[PDB]
Design a protein around this ligand. Structure first.
Ligand SMILES: [Cl-]
Ligand SMILES: [Cl-]
Ligand SMILES: [Cl-]
Ligand SMILES: [Cl-]
Ligand SMILES: [Mg+2]
Ligand SMILES: [Mg+2]
Ligand code: NA
Ligand code: NA
Lengths: 236, 5, 236, 5
């Protein structure tokens, strides 16, 4: 790998510089190099990995949605034929997006998840696994769509089971997991009632635990609770 | 919908 | 080249899709492919080429400035030594930026400028040549800094001479050229008085010609005049 | 300073 010659600490340092410079592709490449050193990641390092790939795939997803919208309009009645170019370019972006998701899933499978024993690391990685299968599901249309959806579901479910046993209801990882699993239910699994129920129960159980928190932890938890509330307002 | 930022 | 097998019209079509998707690296690659077909570019096609590379290099320049600022702070008295990583990563971004500028300059030299006979095409390309040498000058620190600065100056000057002979003072290409040459004087050539004089004369001569314009042309010209005014307000 | 956008 192109980062094989760089020290682990230098890769982490450069990932932080890349973030400051908004160079998210570089940041992801540095963090991939750091993971491939084979040591477990600290909490801060896990968050750098996540930020890097979330920003890369986020740009790809936004571009894919623009292109898919254009393609769908081209397929309406009365639309002038423009040739294969819209489909081709949507496919190009789609293939790049799938490659990034496969890269992340590959890091998780070789070998982040299997070495993650603490709840905070294991839930973090399983949530990531659910998220990147969810991004694959957003673009899937073929024989494997059901299996991709079930892979996302299974990863989220394992993360949920651990988080409910091992973490308080206000823990930000637990909250973000529940938020994303609720989005999965609504947008991927055609289960809006499940999405709504999960968001409401998550919000209410976190509300009841806020009294145990410091001011700083309260701020962290309430920020994510507000996203649950925003979704509930959209969905109801 | 909003996911984790 | 990777675009050698794609039709010229398909490259242009995909450049427009890439713009809509904010995929500026793709857009630039498509437009490079279109230029390499060897035909002259229409006005719309020149503007697609410019938008694509301006957005790519703009992101690189913004990242370079972030990294250079960090590097400069690391070199102050009392700053803790952090190793070679900041310099290395600034150099990486710098080298990529220089590569993009060299790519654009290469397209201009092979063979856009030599085939551009109309004032609107020739001034457009010479302005681009000045701009990309200016971006090289922003990062230059060695034996060739003076020659890079003089290359930018020479390109801008030739564009200015043609524009003043062949275009009205409100023409948006002429205005944007003068705007950028004024920025060159202020930020690159250590000539703030020249920058101010050029911006003021350009603004005043355009003001005096607005009465000849349609409503739509008036809007186009006044938008760029406002940038001249904004710079004058910053500089005086 | 502002250049051409
Ligand atoms: Cl394509
Ligand atoms: Cl479901
Ligand atoms: Cl580097
Ligand atoms: Cl000067
Ligand atoms: Mg615990
Ligand atoms: Mg004329
Ligand atoms: Na076509
Ligand atoms: Na270091």
């Amino acid at each position: 790998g192109a980062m094989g010659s760089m020290e682990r600490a230098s890769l982490i340092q450069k990932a932080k510089l890349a973030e400051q410079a908004e160079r998210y592709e570089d940041m992801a490449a540095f963090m991939k190099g750091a993971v491939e050193k084979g040591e477990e990641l600290s909490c801060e390092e896990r968050n750098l990995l996540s930020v890097a790939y979330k920003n890369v795939v986020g740009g790809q997803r936004a571009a894919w949605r623009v292109l898919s919208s254009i393609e769908q309009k081209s397929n309406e009645e009365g639309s002038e034929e423009k040739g294969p170019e819209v489909r081709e370019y949507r496919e190009k972006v789609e293939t790049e997006l799938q490659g990034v998701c496969d890269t992340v899933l590959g890091l998780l499978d070789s070998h982040l998840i299997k070495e993650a024993g603490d709840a905070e690391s294991r839930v973090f990685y399983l949530k990531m696994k659910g998220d990147y299968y969810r991004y694959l599901a957003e673009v899937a249309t073929g024989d494997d769509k059901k299996r991709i959806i079930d892979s996302a579901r299974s990863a989220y479910q394992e993360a949920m089971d651990i988080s409910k046993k091992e973490m308080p209801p206000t823990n930000p990882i637990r909250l973000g997991l529940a938020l994303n699993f609720s989005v999965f239910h609504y947008e991927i699994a055609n289960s809006p009632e499940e999405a709504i129920s999960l968001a409401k129960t998550t919000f209410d159980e976190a509300m009841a635990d806020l009294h145990t928190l410091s001011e700083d932890s309260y701020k962290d938890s309430t920020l994510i609770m507000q996203l649950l509330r925003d979704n509930l307002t959209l969905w109801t | 919908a909003h996911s984790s930022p």
